[PDB]
Design an enzyme around this catalytic site. Sequence first.
Site, PDB file in Angstrom:
ATOM      1  N   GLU A 122      24.859  25.193  15.889  1.00  0.00           N
ATOM      2  CA  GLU A 122      26.055  25.135  16.488  1.00  0.00           C
ATOM      3  C   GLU A 122      26.549  26.939  16.192  1.00  0.00           C
ATOM      4  O   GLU A 122      26.465  26.402  15.160  1.00  0.00           O
ATOM      5  CB  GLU A 122      26.703  24.776  17.675  1.00  0.00           C
ATOM      6  CG  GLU A 122      27.720  25.410  18.248  1.00  0.00           C
ATOM      7  CD  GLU A 122      28.949  24.224  18.948  1.00  0.00           C
ATOM      8  OE1 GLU A 122      28.850  23.454  19.003  1.00  0.00           O
ATOM      9  OE2 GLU A 122      30.077  25.267  19.216  1.00  0.00           O
ATOM     10  N   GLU A 127      35.708  32.684  20.073  1.00  0.00           N
ATOM     11  CA  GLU A 127      36.938  31.538  19.768  1.00  0.00           C
ATOM     12  C   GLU A 127      37.072  31.618  19.796  1.00  0.00           C
ATOM     13  O   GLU A 127      38.270  32.212  19.038  1.00  0.00           O
ATOM     14  CB  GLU A 127      35.695  30.462  19.613  1.00  0.00           C
ATOM     15  CG  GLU A 127      34.396  29.609  19.294  1.00  0.00           C
ATOM     16  CD  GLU A 127      34.145  28.551  20.274  1.00  0.00           C
ATOM     17  OE1 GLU A 127      34.969  27.725  20.816  1.00  0.00           O
ATOM     18  OE2 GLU A 127      33.075  28.192  20.367  1.00  0.00           O
TER      19      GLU A 127
END
Length: 245
Positions: A122, A127
């Site tokens: 991932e 974020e």
Amino acid sequence: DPNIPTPEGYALVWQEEFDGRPALVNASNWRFENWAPGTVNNELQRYVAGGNDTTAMVKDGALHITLKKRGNEVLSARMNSRESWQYGYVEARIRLPKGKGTWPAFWMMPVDQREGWPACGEIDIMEEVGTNPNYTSSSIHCTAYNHVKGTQKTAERFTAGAEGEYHVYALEWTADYIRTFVDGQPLFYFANDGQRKAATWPFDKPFFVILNLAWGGMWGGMNGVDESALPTTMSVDYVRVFQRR
Ligand SMILES: [Ca+2]
């Protein structure tokens, strides 16, 4: 196009420019998730397809993903790009929402997830959580480096006004390294250790792009959530993918 900032040695291969009234997202580029609350990460929002209870639309040349309370539910949207890529420069111009409990994300998952997560790998390009405003981060996840083992590779930086202003978040992903930038300034770096072991480098296969705005969850809701901040919107001016000539 000479109007597109292009990294040295790269050429554009894919662009979602999100081309003043609202319209539906281009369905040839994106697949939406229809997820009940708590489907992943104990998140509180429901991911829906879209009355005015639409959570993803295009307005003024930008994608808008809006968290909104409807009934006794908080609605949002999560999109996956239908195209995928192995290696490249992945850049999006994003305006973060505001509110304790928000969890905007611009990241990548592989087409092949038969190995399961986090073994499949991932890439987190951007974020952020509204409980710690304007701290954006980048991460990679794999068998060796993940939060269960306490070993997730990540880097974090304060970017003033990231909530409420557009900034350029980008990933440079080659066979040798993964690197991310904020407004052209390097942030995260993760090298291929050259061991050819999937535990430490599962990043040799195609990944697609994910855009989503979660509400609460294991990260977004770790300090609680503030529904008085709703509604709040994450805006994406564009997503561009370059690859080496
Ligand atoms: Ca645009």
